[PDB]
Amino acid sequence: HQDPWKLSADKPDSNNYYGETVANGMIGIISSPEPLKVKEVVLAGTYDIYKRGRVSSFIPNYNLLNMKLAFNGESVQTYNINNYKQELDMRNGAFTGSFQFKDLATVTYSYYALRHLPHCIMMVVNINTQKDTEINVENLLETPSSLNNQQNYFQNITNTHVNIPLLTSVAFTPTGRSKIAVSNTFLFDEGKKLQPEILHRMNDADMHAMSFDKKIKAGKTYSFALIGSLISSDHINDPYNEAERLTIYAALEGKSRLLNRHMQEWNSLWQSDIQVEGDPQAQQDIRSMLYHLYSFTRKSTSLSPSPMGLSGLGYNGHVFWDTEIWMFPPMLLLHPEIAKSMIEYRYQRLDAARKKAAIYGYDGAMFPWESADSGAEETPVNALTGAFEHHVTGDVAIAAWQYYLVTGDKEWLKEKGWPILKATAEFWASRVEKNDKGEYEIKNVVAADEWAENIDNNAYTNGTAIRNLQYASKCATVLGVIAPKEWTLIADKILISKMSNGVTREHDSYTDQNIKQADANLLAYPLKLITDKEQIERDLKYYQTKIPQSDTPAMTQAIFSLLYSRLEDSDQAYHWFKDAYQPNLNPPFRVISECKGGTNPYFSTGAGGVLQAVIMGFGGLDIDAAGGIKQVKSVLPKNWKKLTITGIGIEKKTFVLTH
Amino acid sequence: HQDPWKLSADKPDSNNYYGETVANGMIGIISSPEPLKVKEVVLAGTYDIYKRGRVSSFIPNYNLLNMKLAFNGESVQTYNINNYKQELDMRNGAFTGSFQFKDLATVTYSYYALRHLPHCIMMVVNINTQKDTEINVENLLETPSSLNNQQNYFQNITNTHVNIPLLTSVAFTPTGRSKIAVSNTFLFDEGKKLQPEILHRMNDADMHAMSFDKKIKAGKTYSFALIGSLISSDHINDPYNEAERLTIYAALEGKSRLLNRHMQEWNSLWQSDIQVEGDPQAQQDIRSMLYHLYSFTRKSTSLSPSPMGLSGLGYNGHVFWDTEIWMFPPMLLLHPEIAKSMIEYRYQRLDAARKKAAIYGYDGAMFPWESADSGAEETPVNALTGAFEHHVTGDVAIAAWQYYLVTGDKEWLKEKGWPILKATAEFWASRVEKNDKGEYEIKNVVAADEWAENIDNNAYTNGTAIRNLQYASKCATVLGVIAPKEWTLIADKILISKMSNGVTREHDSYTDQNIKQADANLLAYPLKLITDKEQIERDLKYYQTKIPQSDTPAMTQAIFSLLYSRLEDSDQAYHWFKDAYQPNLNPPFRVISECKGGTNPYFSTGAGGVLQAVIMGFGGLDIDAAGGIKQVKSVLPKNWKKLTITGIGIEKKTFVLTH
């Protein structure tokens, strides 16, 4: 079960099953233990009021691939199939199931979120017969209870060469904010005269279906595909006509062309890769972490991943600093154009951040704790993070500057980076208060350690303000512009304190409390305000005892690991690398939950930090404060014989580490 | 677990659990295996387009009892309770759960669909603690995905003596056809000054909650109740205000008064009962059947039960001949005022039946195959029973005449019976076709055996037409009005044909096909057109093996039982009695599914049938064609020592049978 490219499950157990996702950064499809079904489908960029939090959310969408298959009268179910297996090929995001039906046929089905066509999905079904049999195939378009005012359509698009049957639905998100259209068709190899007639049934208020029968003789293979397109008014003004147009298009491109395009784009993604010799389980795990970040992001866009990417409704689909600090750094090293999309998401919401700042009495741009379509604040109001966790504004500025450092694109710095850095720094200049002693303070925040609420001088928050003001000043110099001299004066006197045991104090009320996740330790990495190895070690040893086993998210141990690799302590780095995700795993695909023993995968934020422990920690790779990627001292786990990181930085460098 | 009054389950197993229902003929609440939750709630009379069949349906409603209980911050879960038991007390429809929380406290909760107040529910909670502790109690009002455009309110109703905190939700059925209001409050014993402060949270789009803490001292019992009122625009013009009014009212009546009234009404229902000696399983099973009918009906109304009563969304809540022929006859004998509501339902829908006949080119009234709010046809269009299964009209007439036979109420005959009998006979007079031989045919129907579709001269349909015409004529005689002599001429010449072996032919195309359910046999009972014992017997011998084991509903073997009891064949009567329901049971409460090994309880139609096998078969009780209840020869199961039937007919007779 440790193939380095594939995740395998024999005989799915529906009582203990967490499905895996295929996605193209726009549509995610989460697997079902049941054959020829999907559990959930999510469309990026489509938000409406729905359940959790009383604020916008991703919306469960059409399970557009759901199919029912019958042989010689008899419905294929979990209960009457044998040798059933599922597999995720991470090389191309193919999810495959396969089974035997009695004495009649082997069935294999593979589905894909087509990597070049953001709104298109394809399933390919192969029937190999051991006896003569007749199949009945049905594709169902059930309108999920999250949508309303559905309409169920069917038509034939024809010319002399083709008969393309379209099963279409149109419906609305709960408040009517977004109109969703889905349109499906079957592709056959045999051509218009010989293809099965397609029947259409509309027997329920919330479900219609298209269906056909086909006689297959013993010893033959019969194939067909299902193509579906899924789009909304958030993506295009006329989703109904756009859905049908895209499914027509894809049908006339055909399976072969579509898959070849899919494959070419996946191949390009895997040109940046991490290879580990001597530890197959690590190898597979790290490939799964890469796979998920590649599936949940998309070059050449303004999309940014939620903490759970497209694996479901985790955190409502909202964007957090989980992007900037956790998922963004490994992507920026491996595929900068992905990082470009993530920061583009913020650039386009700068005006919304300006608006927040004005509503809360500050200058500049105040990015929201949680962000969705507009870029306004979308945190549930019962969570004090929304009003008071303010580091996110500095987190956005850090990643913007980092983009510049790694790409050296001064054209992007002038047009997009500087507007961000300038406005965020104007926010911090307005956010601080000078005291009698000439120090600057930032009072009344929720810490990165979110258990500490309405406290003063949070170490991490204070550190991001310092960085934000310093990077905006560095950027003004790059661009030949005059920065407010106040920005450096402030950065230099923002308070960061130590306790009497010589440990960095997390906040002004901090003595010895348990903490939710890493905060003071983040000044060592990523912020690198603390670079004295003794201080790093003092702070590690103190805080590593303060994280409880329960209810603490995977935004911690990866950092411990990373700093221990930078201090060249192999055993401890490897201990914290495993502890970061292994306690969080869900069967049968080793997906990652947010917290230890949790049941809410897939926490791509978690994957993002572990990838940093691997690349920046074991690989010793580092964004150089002066430009590009450098390599610092590192160690490997004892049992890893070789680590190979490919496609790094704009020179696409390969790094090989050994003992 | 064979208490004759109580159904009981130890340690509910959620992987194999079919909940039991409490109901007052208006609201039904179906149990959850989870402590202090309910699975589903259904309000009678509220219909909208929703899922199955693309036609009107009962809607899942607010799970208004749902409660969360914590002890010093620790919520109750499966893994921290023990000695968890559930019980349904059939004497008063009380559903009770009980459990122990760790070794700290014991908890019981009993809930009720209050019998006298159709729109009000009550749950009483009792907590006995060993040590000092603090409880947190939350009542959650989650808007189900079946409803839309919800609003979540909370307010305090006060005077010098009380503070009634109301948690209210108002929402709409899928098309906006019905507006639903729910309003809950907590009742305390301790009085306004000492009662807990109630907090309100609205943290989700689709859920709000009211909560309180309370300190309980070591060795003391703390008791509180939750009252809920659930009502719609189908029942009142202003449900929002009526729901709050009703809960205020119930709150100031108080628990004690509310339960006393409930008990009195249940006590009356059980004045008609069936007692079996020598077979405890039978006794419990039969009580369960009576309980479900009593719970799923209501005297002094125009309500009629669906095939699944208020147990869920079975057959979309629609009314079928399952009332008139299956549920109605035991209710007529035991509690005629329940039968009076069932036929009232048809009386107030006579104009819609006249409209149906006109639209399908017939005279008089043509009752729909499936009925709901208006009395128009509600059968899903994909089912040819809607257009072609016409015997329903004669089934309505039969029940209307029986009502008169049993009660002797000639004032009702004039006002309500005769309108029905006259219009329904006018239908049949227009529905027959005379042939060259002077016989009357009824062509192109779906048979009671619904596997026979678009066939001629169905036995059961033809018999219901004869009976309809005869009984209309007799009604005319009683009332002194002139009936068409054609009714009698047509009745006496409607075709009922024999095969060469002398067996009643099901329809003109019938030879030896398997059949879905009893049809020719129904001519013996209930119609009594076949009285000759050798004919009854030859029809039984031919047809009894024609019903397959699978996918055949519980509308067959109860009739075989009854007929064998009338033929004085104890072994066969008892064989069919058990076969009618025991292969259809689901755990842990022995609820009845529609079919053998099915999974869609509670099929109240199948219970009605069995209750006829017991009352009319084993008890020998019969509606006398001349008026009243008579008794014919019968036999008991060998192992039954005594069968006692109480509350029969308008004189409330007790029948006792022994070997």
Ligand SMILES: OC[C@H]1O[C@H](OC[C@H]2O[C@@H](O)[C@H](O)[C@@H](O)[C@@H]2O)[C@H](O)[C@@H](O)[C@@H]1O
């Ligand atoms: O989506 C809202 C909010 O959810 C998570 O936080 C909930 C509360 O958790 C506690 O740990 C913390 O003490 C509070 O400050 C939080 O409101 C999430 O961690 C948070 O980032 C989200 O905004």
Ligand SMILES: OC[C@H]1O[C@H](OC[C@H]2O[C@@H](O)[C@H](O)[C@@H](O)[C@@H]2O)[C@H](O)[C@@H](O)[C@@H]1O
């Ligand atoms: O509510 C619709 C319909 O449901 C059930 O019938 C479905 C089909 O069942 C077959 O067995 C039969 O041959 C057909 O005539 C039916 O349409 C139900 O039995 C029926 O009464 C309902 O009207």
